[PDB]
């Protein structure tokens, strides 16, 4: 895929998911429409997933230091990754995955 | 024995190996081992009678012999071996070591 990331012929299967609709008093005479009145309602719970991964473990011979992903050692206003006096996350840069160097 | 000049005596092994909470890392280098002091052991000193002023007085003996020092880190880990070492962990403490002389001439 462009974006990225695992192309999968048979992906993680979505799930879909709603409320069962509950209507509201039907009148006392049948009619034949459907019920137009329904109850407002919305739901919540905990979700929880886990991904099991495999990591490619690295050996590498190379002599010298590699380059590697460091916050910056200089003070700061406020700690990136982490709240802010809001209380707003928010992530300051995109991380890539390519750091550790390899042999074409 | 069954050895003789006609054979190496050691290999050489620079490898290094991180194998879950140990990391056993060798070594080898070339040593070349000059004759010393014409084989005399001698007193040396240095008086504070000369320039000297009485803090660095000393006296003792310098000995024909000689001996290996390997005491420092960068002897025993690669620029990279340090690397992963300060970065992936909290500690760190010797368990054993060995020690090989080997293809003498």
Known sequence: PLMGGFGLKHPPPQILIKNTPVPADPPTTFSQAKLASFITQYSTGQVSVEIEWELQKENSKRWNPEIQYTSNYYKSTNVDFAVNTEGTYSEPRPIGTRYLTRNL | GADGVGSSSGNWHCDSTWLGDRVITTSTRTWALPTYNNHLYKQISNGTSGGSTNDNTYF?????????????????????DWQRLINNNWGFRPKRLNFKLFNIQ
């Open chain 2, 60 to 80: 003792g003996y310098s000995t024909p012999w000689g001996y290996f020092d390997f005491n420092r880190f960068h002897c025993h880990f690669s620029p990279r």
